[PDB]
Amino acid sequence: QSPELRKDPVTNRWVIFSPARAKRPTDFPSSCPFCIGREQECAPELFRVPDHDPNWKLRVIENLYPALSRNLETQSTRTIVGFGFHDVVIESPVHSIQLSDIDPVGIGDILIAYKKRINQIAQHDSINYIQVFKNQGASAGASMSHSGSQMMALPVVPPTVSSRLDGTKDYFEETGKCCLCEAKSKHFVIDESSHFVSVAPFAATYPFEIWIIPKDHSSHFHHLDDVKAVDLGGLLKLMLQKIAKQLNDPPYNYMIHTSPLKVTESQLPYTHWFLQIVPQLSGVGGFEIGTGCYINPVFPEDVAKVMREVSLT
Amino acid sequence: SPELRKDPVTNRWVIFSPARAKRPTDFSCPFCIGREQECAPELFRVPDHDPNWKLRVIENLYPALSRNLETQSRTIVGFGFHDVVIESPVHSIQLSDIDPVGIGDILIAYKKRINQIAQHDSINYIQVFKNQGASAGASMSHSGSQMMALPVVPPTVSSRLDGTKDYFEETGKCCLCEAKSKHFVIDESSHFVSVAPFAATYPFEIWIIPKDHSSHFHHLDDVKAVDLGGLLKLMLQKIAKQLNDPPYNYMIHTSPLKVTESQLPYTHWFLQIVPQLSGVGGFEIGTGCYINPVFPEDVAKVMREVSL
Numbered sequence A: 001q002s003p004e005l006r007k008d009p010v011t012n013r014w015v016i017f018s019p020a021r022a023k024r025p026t027d028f029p030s031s032c033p034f035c036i037g038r039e040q041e042c043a044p045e046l047f048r049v050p051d052h053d054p055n056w057k058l059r060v061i062e063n064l065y066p067a068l069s070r071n072l073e074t075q076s077t078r079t080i081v082g083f084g085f086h087d088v089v090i091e092s093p094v095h096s097i098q099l100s101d102i103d104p105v106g107i108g109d110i111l112i113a114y115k116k117r118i119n120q121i122a123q124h125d126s127i128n129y130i131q132v133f134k135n136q137g138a139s140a141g142a143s144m145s146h147s148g149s150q151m152m153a154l155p156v157v158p159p160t161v162s163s164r165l166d167g168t169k170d171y172f173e174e175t176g177k178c179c180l181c182e183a184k185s186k187h188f189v190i191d192e193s194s195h196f197v198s199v200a201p202f203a204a205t206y207p208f209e210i211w212i213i214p215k216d217h218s219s220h221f222h223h224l225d226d227v228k229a230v231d232l233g234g235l236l237k238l239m240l241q242k243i244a245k246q247l248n249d250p251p252y253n254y255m256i257h258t259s260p261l262k263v264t265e266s267q268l269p270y271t272h273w274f275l276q277i278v279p280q281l282s283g284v285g286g287f288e289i290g291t292g293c294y295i296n297p298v299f300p301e302d303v304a305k306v307m308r309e310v311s312l313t
Numbered sequence B: 001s002p003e004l005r006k007d008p009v010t011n012r013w014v015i016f017s018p019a020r021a022k023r024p025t026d027f028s029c030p031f032c033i034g035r036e037q038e039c040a041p042e043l044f045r046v047p048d049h050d051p052n053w054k055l056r057v058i059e060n061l062y063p064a065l066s067r068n069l070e071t072q073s074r075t076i077v078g079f080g081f082h083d084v085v086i087e088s089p090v091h092s093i094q095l096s097d098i099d100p101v102g103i104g105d106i107l108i109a110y111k112k113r114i115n116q117i118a119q120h121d122s123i124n125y126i127q128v129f130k131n132q133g134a135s136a137g138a139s140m141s142h143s144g145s146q147m148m149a150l151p152v153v154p155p156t157v158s159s160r161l162d163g164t165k166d167y168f169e170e171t172g173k174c175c176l177c178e179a180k181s182k183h184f185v186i187d188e189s190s191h192f193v194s195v196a197p198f199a200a201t202y203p204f205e206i207w208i209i210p211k212d213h214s215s216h217f218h219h220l221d222d223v224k225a226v227d228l229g230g231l232l233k234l235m236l237q238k239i240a241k242q243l244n245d246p247p248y249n250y251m252i253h254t255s256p257l258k259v260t261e262s263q264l265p266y267t268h269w270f271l272q273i274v275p276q277l278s279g280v281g282g283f284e285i286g287t288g289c290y291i292n293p294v295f296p297e298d299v300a301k302v303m304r305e306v307s308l
Ligand SMILES: Nc1ncnc2c1ncn2[C@@H]1O[C@H](COP(=O)(O)OP(=O)(O)O[C@H]2O[C@H](CO)[C@@H](O)[C@H](O)[C@H]2O)[C@@H](O)[C@H]1O
Pocket: A033, A034, A041, A042, A043, A061, A062, A063, A064, A065, A066, A088, A134, A135, A140, A141, A142, A143, A144, A145, A148, A149, A150, B023, B024, B278, B279, B280, B281, B282, B283, B284, B291
C-alpha cells in the first residue's frame, strides 16, 4: 500500500506508515530472588498483597540497582541531583507464571498496588511524574525472567508528557474536545469492556501498538477504583492473550500514561490517562535516532481488523 | 552516584546511573559492482558516470516515503525521498576501513544529493544516517548509509532549535561553538573536534562537531570533507578497538532546509555516533527520557587513551 504520514495530539508528532518496508530482504531459571521463600535476597519491601500475608500474591519492593536515589531528596529542593524512586512490582510468587496468565481479579490487584504506591510517592512535593511500565522478554529489555513490572518517580516532567500536554491542549482549543474521550471515532476499535476500550491508535508509533483507554474522562490512573481495576485487568489480559496468539508470543512493553502530579485545573479537561502496549517486533536504526520520527509497517486499520478476528478458543 | 543532565541540543534531561551496569541478567550482494541491475535506479555515482565507480547513490527499493507523491505533497501523503548510499564497490570493506580521502568522497556525495534535494520546496529536512551491524538495524551486510528527505521538520530538529535558541537568548552564545568548554574532548582535527557529550543519551556516544560555526552540513568543502573523513575514521576505529567491534549508528544533525536568518546564530550542525550497546525498556518508551550507565567524563578518558 501507499505510504502515509499520520499525526495525533497524544504523541504530538508525525509517524510514517509504510507497508512496503516489511517486504525488504535481510542478510542476517526455575527460581530466582523474586520467587516466594527468597524474600531476603531482595531489596527492601514496601508492601505485599495480601498485606503481611506470608502467602503473598504480589510484592512491591525497592529496585536493588535503582536509576535514581531516594536519599538525594533534600538536595532535590544543566545538572540536578539524581533523586527519585525506583521500585519493582513482583507480579507472582511462581517464577513461570506470566502476567497474561493471571486472572482478571489478580491483574486488577496488581493495578491497585500501582495505585497504592503512586499515592505514597505523591506525598512528595519533589516528584513531578511517576512512570509505571512493564518489560516482558529479553528483546523488550527484560533482565529478570520472573514476571514483574516497575515504577520510576521523576523529579521532572519527561518529554512524552510535555508533548502530550501540548498536543492535547491544541486539540482542545481548536475543537473544544478531549481527543481520548473521542477514542471510538478517532481510533480503530478492537475490544471494549464495561469501562475501557482498546484501540489501534490512528497515528501509532509501532506496529500492532494498542491503547487501552478509560471511556470516562479520567486524568489520573491513580483514580482507578476496585470495580474498574478488575474490568481493566480483564481487558488488559485479553489484549495480551490476543497479542500472544496472533503474533506468536513476542516480547512486549506496556506503559501507563498519566497526569503530572502538579497538573493544573486548566489542564484537566484534555488530560486523559491510558495504557500503551507495544509488542516488540523490531528495533530502530539511524533514521529514528536522528529524527524522533518512527516508521510503521502496519496501518492500524489492519491491526484492528486482525485483532477483532482473534479467537481465544 | 546518579545524576540528571541536560543539554540545549537534546533539550532534555538524561539520567546517568552507573549502578545500573551492575544488575544481573537471566538472559557478494545486489550492491556489489556489476550487479547494478539488481538495484533501484541510480541517482549518481562517483566518479561521475565512471563504470569503475567508488560509490553510488541510488533510490531505495523498499522506500519509507514515496518520491512519486510530490504533486499531492491529521494525515498528509507519504511523499519524500528515500535514497541509499553504497560506500564501496566491494562487499567486505566497511566504512571505517576506507582511507580519509575516500570517506570524504562519501561525505561530498551526501552534500551533492542534499543539494539536488533542496531544489524541492516540498522538502523540509533531510536525515543522513548509517546503520552498521544487525543489532543497529542493518538489513544489507554491504557498507551503505541512507538519506531520508522529509516534508516536515521532525521532533529532534524542533527540540534542538528550541533548546539552542533558549541558550542563545540566555547567553548570546552558540552552545556548540562552546564545544571545548561544554563537553569532554576526545580528539580534534584541523576543522572538527570529537566529544563525549555532557548529557549524552547513550553510553559511549560521541559527537563530531565543526569548530567553525556552520549551520548546514552541506556547506562542507573538499578540504573539510577529508579532514572530517579522518576524524570519523578515527572515532569509528577507536570504538571498534575499545568496544570489541560493536554495531553502530551515525546520524548527521543539520538545519532545516527553510531555516530562517534569525535561527542561524545558534544553529550548528554535528555528526552523532551511537555505538549499539544496549536496548530500551518501558521507561524510555513511556517517558522519552533515557538512562545512561557511563559518565561522559569516563568515556572521554578511555577514548583519549586508545592507541591504534
Ligand atoms: N534482588 C533484587 N531485588 C530488587 N530488585 C532487583 C533484584 N535483582 C534485580 N532487580 C531489579 O529488577 C529489575 C528487573 O527489571 P526488567 O527485567 O523489567 O528490566 P530492567 O530494568 O533490567 O532493564 C530494562 O528496562 C530498563 C527500564 O526501561 C531499561 O533502561 C533497560 O535498558 C532495559 O534493559 C531490574 O531493574 C533490577 O535492577
